[PDB]
Amino acid sequence: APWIERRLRYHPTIELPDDTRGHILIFGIDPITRTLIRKLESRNHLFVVVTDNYDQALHLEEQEGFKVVYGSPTDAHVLAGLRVAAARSIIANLSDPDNANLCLTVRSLCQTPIIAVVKEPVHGELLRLAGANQVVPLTRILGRYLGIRATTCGALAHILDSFGNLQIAELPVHGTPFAGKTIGESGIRQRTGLSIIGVWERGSLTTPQRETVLTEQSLLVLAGTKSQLAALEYLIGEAPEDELIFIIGHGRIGCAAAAFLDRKPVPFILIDRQESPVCNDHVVVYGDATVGQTLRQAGIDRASGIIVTTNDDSTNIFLTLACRHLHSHIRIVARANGEENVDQLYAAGADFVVSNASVGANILGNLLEHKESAFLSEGMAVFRRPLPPAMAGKTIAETRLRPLTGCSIVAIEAPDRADILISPPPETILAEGARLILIGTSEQEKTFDQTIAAR
Amino acid sequence: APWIERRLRYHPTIELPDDTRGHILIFGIDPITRTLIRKLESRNHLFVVVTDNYDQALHLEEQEGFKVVYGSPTDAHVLAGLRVAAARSIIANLSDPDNANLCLTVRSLCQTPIIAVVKEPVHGELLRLAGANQVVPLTRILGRYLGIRATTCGALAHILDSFGNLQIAELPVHGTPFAGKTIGESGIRQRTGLSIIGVWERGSLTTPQRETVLTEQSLLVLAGTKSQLAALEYLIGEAPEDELIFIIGHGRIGCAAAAFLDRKPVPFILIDRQESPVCNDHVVVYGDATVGQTLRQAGIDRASGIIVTTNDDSTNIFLTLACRHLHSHIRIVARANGEENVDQLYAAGADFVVSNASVGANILGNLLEHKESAFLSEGMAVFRRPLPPAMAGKTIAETRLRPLTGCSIVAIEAPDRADILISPPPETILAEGARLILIGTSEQEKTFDQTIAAR
Amino acid sequence: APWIERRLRYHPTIELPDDTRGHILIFGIDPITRTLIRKLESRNHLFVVVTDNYDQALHLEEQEGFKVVYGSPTDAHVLAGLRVAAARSIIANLSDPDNANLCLTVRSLCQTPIIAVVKEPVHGELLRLAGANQVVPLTRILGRYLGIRATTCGALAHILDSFGNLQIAELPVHGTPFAGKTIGESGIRQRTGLSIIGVWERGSLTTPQRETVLTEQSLLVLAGTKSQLAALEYLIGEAPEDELIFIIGHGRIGCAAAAFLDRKPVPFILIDRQESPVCNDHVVVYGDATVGQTLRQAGIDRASGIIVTTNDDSTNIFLTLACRHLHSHIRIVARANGEENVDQLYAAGADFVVSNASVGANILGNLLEHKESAFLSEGMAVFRRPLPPAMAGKTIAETRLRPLTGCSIVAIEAPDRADILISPPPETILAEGARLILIGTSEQEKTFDQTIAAR
Amino acid sequence: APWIERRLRYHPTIELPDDTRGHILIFGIDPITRTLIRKLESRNHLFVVVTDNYDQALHLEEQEGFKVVYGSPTDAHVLAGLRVAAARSIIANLSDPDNANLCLTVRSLCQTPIIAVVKEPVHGELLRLAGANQVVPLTRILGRYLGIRATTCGALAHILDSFGNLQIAELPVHGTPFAGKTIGESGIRQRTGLSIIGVWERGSLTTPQRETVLTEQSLLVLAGTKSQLAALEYLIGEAPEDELIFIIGHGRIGCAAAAFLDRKPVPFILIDRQESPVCNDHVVVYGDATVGQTLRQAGIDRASGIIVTTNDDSTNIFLTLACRHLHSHIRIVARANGEENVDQLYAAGADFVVSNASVGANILGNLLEHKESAFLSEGMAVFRRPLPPAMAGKTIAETRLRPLTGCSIVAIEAPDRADILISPPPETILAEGARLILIGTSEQEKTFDQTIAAR
Ligand SMILES: Nc1ncnc2c1ncn2[C@@H]1O[C@H](COP(=O)(O)O)[C@@H](O)[C@H]1O
Ligand SMILES: Nc1ncnc2c1ncn2[C@@H]1O[C@H](COP(=O)(O)O)[C@@H](O)[C@H]1O
Ligand SMILES: Nc1ncnc2c1ncn2[C@@H]1O[C@H](COP(=O)(O)O)[C@@H](O)[C@H]1O
Ligand SMILES: Nc1ncnc2c1ncn2[C@@H]1O[C@H](COP(=O)(O)O)[C@@H](O)[C@H]1O
Ligand SMILES: [Ca+2]
Ligand SMILES: [Ca+2]
Ligand SMILES: [Ca+2]
Ligand SMILES: [Ca+2]
Ligand SMILES: [Zn+2]
Ligand SMILES: [Zn+2]
Ligand SMILES: [Zn+2]
Ligand SMILES: [Zn+2]
């Protein structure tokens, strides 16, 4: 066995057997890709994590879920041994230069798809050029999610502007009037005309029922026109005269959150242990937040909210304990670097925990699992239309919309106050006065109305 | 055999059997904790150290007295492996943030008692909030027991005010007209009106006897009123003018020492290589002290006492030789980080040695072997009542001091020149002018002043 | 048993077996020397790499082409066990100081030929003194080869001045009126009278046919008078103004390129993370090129070309992409250290790539297995003569030049548009109007014309 | 089965056989110490090296001549393990503080001898107190022997002034008129009246004879009067007009050389890269000597001598070469850290070479067996007398000189113009007119003439 075997001097694996197919191979093991493995164990997937650190290989070889290979990720010969042409997907999670090198190298050998994690927003373009076909600015995203949760009140965070008509935004419920209520009694479609595409609750995008009661923690995906969204901003109200978010840590994430807050102009103060060599736009206070007066003197006592974004979890927990114990009114949003700390961050007294490991693994998994659906929608228009009077009663197949307009239907919201139906089967009876959501070419969107009217 | 397994490639124990009850597990092994294990080796309990350092685990594997488990100690899955819920207790000797994390984690799984060693006294509150049943500011204690021994004479050093009630104080008998004299020709009981709880020698509190000779090293434990303690302050005599104390090493222990000396107003000078990343109150003279030209320039020639407080014991020894060579009169107090450097620090000519491990291990070891005896000692007051007129010369168990108000006597004093008895068995005959030293509830002692006068 | 000894505890080879002869040993293993061992695998040369690093020995054992010895290069006993006397030749690729030590130690034992790589051009002399037969300033060569490529246009780069008459020049084609033309169409010889000895294409020296298409990657190797080079210079046209070159990386190679560009007065700018521990002659801008505005604010906007000379390949790949992307018109020469990246650098958008490992291992290759011709080409002349009329139609041997003049024909250039013939065989028939290129001594050169006429 | 233990996982020894006697044990291995074991290999003594570093124990194990033991050198229970009380003697070659700590710890267990290498002259006193019997400032000695050899012509150098009658001093023979002519044909013995005690050559010493030839390499050891040294100094002839010595490397040993050359006021320049953590007394030109400019610009053109005193031999060798080449006249003294580099230093061009390994090992060896000859030698005022008339023609077996005065003759200067006898046996015939160097007391020197003649 390899049982008896591995009690002898250790040697790493260098290459994979020739018949290796449909494996996913990971470059840049960390808590986000470790979570991605664990999470995709419902499928008998094969994960190959590649390390060029001989010492790392040794330790990973005792962990299950995945196979470790040792070798230089940027040498064609190593990649060839990994059977990159035969692989299902490739996850590029290295430094940005190392990723470009990785891409270009594999791209010289095959077209196997690559999802790359980009550490600097502006680098995304470059990783595409190098041949990544999917580029996830994880730290930008993780920042945004901190930014969103941090305000006293919670406003609209824009997600999509589809060709200057239909818009998609999210809305945290916390400061809002809608907190502790049902989706029905909140009166959103009734006051605004907006559609509620869904609800985030635990990285789970749930179809929103009428009876569903939303918490302080609920995040509401919404679609509508710019004007409609405005009507909604009016309803939530305006923020406190003097809110001030205080961001502990100005690493790549803290920087992102800061960059988020600056757009909806929200004042913030930043603490870091270090001048941090990428940012030239944010004025930072230097010190160890862990040290006594550091925080008080930096003026944490004027803050309406705190964002705990240290690369160390023990620290994040500690700062949470401290800020809650000292300033028990302030809203605290904390970053969880590993998923095995998320609970302690709550225990310590955080209001929300952005769980990096989950959020990341979650995005990656979806890009893997829903590859085709994502592709099929690239560059397409999403728009909303009142059902044409002469189509009421009809079934979806009966309207013949795709063959006549090119556009098809992806969601219907019922005429009555009734939950949204996403991905309706073609045998769906189109009700009295429902609104429908349609994906189509943007050119065909411009034209849809004209053809429906023509017939 | 694990003698043959010793010789094959190393693999670390990662968890504990299911049948593992009453074990004592330790987080952050160090001189203090290694000493603890050695000390309570007679009390038949298995000790378990936990490290996330692979190599440390290796080197500790071969060590006797305790076994090693290699795992991230802030992880619930690891903790479960360790069978925390089934442990006797936990020693949390990690960093402060790391302690808070380990704390909140073990609380979400179980209720097992946790003694926490605290790096910064201020953080004491937070770690109780984190879930610690007990919290120990060791450095402040070690910083205290240094300064105590630094003064030429040695004065009152307060341990606790029982809130208006009698108070507990320690007295180093070195520069006192009580040095050399046995208990009685000192006359503390007779001519002051105080009680001698115990005498420390080399880190162990003894039965104070009439014949026991006080030396320089002897440290007394005292109980009495505000005016009773101040009655002995003049009995010591005048502590000579021109009193300045040099402390070498302004780390945490060094800093603690300085701040102690500044409470009972006493001047000192601080020397260190590096600027403290923690302290900002004390002005430090900078330079290596091993080079003698630096100490000289600092005015060490106008000093009455030295405190040697360095991370390295080999240096501490060397500095003690350097001084006893120059100033053969000066009071030198040295700190030993290890226990195996104590005798050499004496041999070099130190007047008292504060053994970091000996002191540390005592404080823990006691909290352990008196766990459900000193835990409800949080908020309790200690008091001394006279012997009742009607209940004179009758048995203690019969007096019914538990089923009257709710009181309990931990020690009793004798009227004649007869030796005191600490924690005595419940069958002894009382006497004439005796004084009872009890512990109780902060509202039961108030009742006793009229309860024993009515019942 | 060779594969079982692999699974036991590691012990390195200390010495070669006594009977070892004719082997090539290498001190200072790196990409260049590793490419060397690959390139000369056609020959059954035995390579032994020596290392004083215990760990480096381990990871090189399981590597093919060469065997590893663990010892101190500069211990006379280590060399003795390495059988240095019996060795074919030695490569010195340590630091200058260690090289010097190595050579002196080696000379202490034997006369075995040493080829030494010289980090510092000025230290060339010192290493020859030390015992080294051949001295290679690889950093300077690589520096020069970047500089040649980096100009907007490409100009003559002198290589040899053989006793003040026949000259040898290099000429990169890229900017010139020859790019895209065949050698024939270029009209060089027609208008110049230069001999085209060669074309470098991909590190490979090719024979110039009249119909080989010169591309932008092509490096002509020319032979001729100073006035003839002067003529070619006139034909290339005037260089364009505002030429300014950005050199990213200012370690040895960048520095070398920079110094090269300084001769033909060519403006440049240097960037580096670090201050140079070696170069006091060069004003340097400071920053990580990788970081965004670093380059912009340094004024890479008005650069005409860019040498990307970092010591890390992924970085240089990243930087080439970045520049090709944001400044597409700007010419880019990039340095590859290690051959597994040359392709990617082209893929990224590099105009030219200079392969340290190729160029290096190539030069070292010729210096090895052309030993008894290389350093016997020391004190030697390269000259050109019209084939003496009488020998037209006679064979080379038939002519008997070597016996008569001591001179060896090395190149025959045929009268008409016909191909140059390099290192022609003795059986070659000499043409009618052919020009000869001969190798001999300066004395032999002088005697030649008389020896031919009078004899 | 030692070749079996070798293939399984490594385990160091942590103690020795319960019956290890007469073993000499070394603390802190380094060149000098590793040489000591080689040098005294002829004597069947067990050498035991002790390191607290693990990897050290690993590598020292596969090395012949000495047994390796892993342990904490300062732990008393480790020392009991080493069986110190039974060892022949102890070499403490740790740092100063560690050395102190060691000494005391062993002094807690036994009365076994200790030779201690000091790093700072001023601390040697502290080490004696600590328990070292013999204390040796190598770095001081080594700096001296470097400065002695650096003078253009070579002057006298004072070893000892014993109370002010007999002076012992050294003389390099390099530039003196005595260079080349045998001890006889220079008449030092004859003209100066000085006792030539020793000639030093290639690190060794034996009895000087008239036929033995003094090369530039030679260093004489002389006993005499202040008038006689003053006579030798005349024979030397004046030092050259303008002379300056450059010292490369202001480390411990470099610094000592500089100090030495201030006694005899000789101008000198110091170069180093780093500031001295120790020396305040010396001005230093800061620069890397290796780099070109550094030396020349620091005015090395006008030097008369150079002392090359770097940590790193390869640097010394390289510098020697560089100097010898630039300055063929200027005399060069170079320091060799390991014996395996000595030969290459001469090869490079060094006029003289000081071998730290030799010089150091000689001293320790002569203190380990002439440990028995340090028992009946030192501290006695070394004095010189002719033979008392009443001892002419009689043996030491008949004279009984030592029990009478208390002095023992360490040198019988032969009757005629005949060679000296050092450490003579007690059966040696004494000749009529003869000089004696006695290392007895000046108790028994001012007593000598009285006692030696009255009986
Ligand atoms: N105690 C602390 N106080 C302030 N900043 C910290 C502390 N610990 C870590 N950091 C910062 O947290 C940031 C983490 O960066 P990133 O992981 O990229 O978001 C770094 O800039 C660290 O300097
Ligand atoms: N020779 C020395 N002179 C002055 N300070 C020192 C020396 N050696 C160590 N230290 C410092 O003494 C401090 C000990 O910290 P603590 O144990 O907390 O008092 C550390 O901060 C060390 O940097
Ligand atoms: N991102 C970067 N930006 C600027 N310079 C760099 C970067 N990375 C490495 N270098 C420098 O490139 C140089 C390469 O050295 P050499 O191999 O001697 O040419 C070194 O001096 C490095 O400090
Ligand atoms: N290239 C160099 N140029 C100048 N000084 C050097 C160089 N290399 C080493 N040194 C110095 O040589 C000294 C050797 O120390 P020691 O062995 O104690 O005499 C050190 O203090 C170094 O700073
Ligand atoms: Ca946790
Ligand atoms: Ca000790
Ligand atoms: Ca590559
Ligand atoms: Ca050598
Ligand atoms: Zn920023
Ligand atoms: Zn302080
Ligand atoms: Zn430069
Ligand atoms: Zn100095």
Provide the descriptors you would attach to this structure in a database record.
homotetramer; 455 residues; alpha/beta; Rossmann fold; Alpha-Beta Plaits; 4 domains; six-stranded parallel sheet; 35% helix; globular; binds adenosine monophosphate; binds calcium ion; binds zinc ion; transport protein; Membrane Protein
Descriptive report:
Four copies of one chain form a homotetramer. With 455 residues, chain A is α/β, with parallel strands linked by helices. The first copy, chain A, folds into four domains: 1-136, Rossmann fold, CATH 3.40.50.720; 137-153 and 243-375, 3-Layer(aba) Sandwich (Rossmann fold), CATH 3.40.50.720; 154-242, Alpha-Beta Plaits, CATH 3.30.70; 376-455, Regulator of K+ conductance, C-terminal domain (Alpha-Beta Plaits, 2-Layer Sandwich). The first copy, chain A, has 19 helices and 21 strands. Chain A has helices at residues 2-5, 31-39, 54-60, 76-82, 96-107, 123-129, 138-150, 183-186, 188-191, 226-236, 252-263, 292-298, 313-326, 342-348, 356-369, 371-377, 396-399, 401-405, 442-454, and strands at 24-27, 47-51, 66-70, 89-92, 114-117, 134-136, 157-161, 167-172, 195-200, 205-206, 219-224, 245-248, 268-272, 284-286, 305-308, 331-336, 352-355, 381-386, 408-413, 420-422, 435-440. In chain A, the strands form four sheets. A six-stranded parallel β-sheet of chain A has the order 3-2-1-4-5-6, with helices on both faces. A six-stranded parallel β-sheet of chain A has the order 14-13-12-15-16-17, with helices on both faces. In chain A, helix 7 (138-150) crosses helix 11 (252-263). The first copy, chain A, is globular. The termini of chain A are far apart. The interface between A and C is medium-sized, with 28 and 27 residues. The structure holds adenosine monophosphate (4 copies), calcium ion (4 copies) and zinc ion (4 copies). Residues 248-249, 251-254, 271-274, 288-290, 309-312, 315 of chain B line the site of one adenosine monophosphate (AMP).
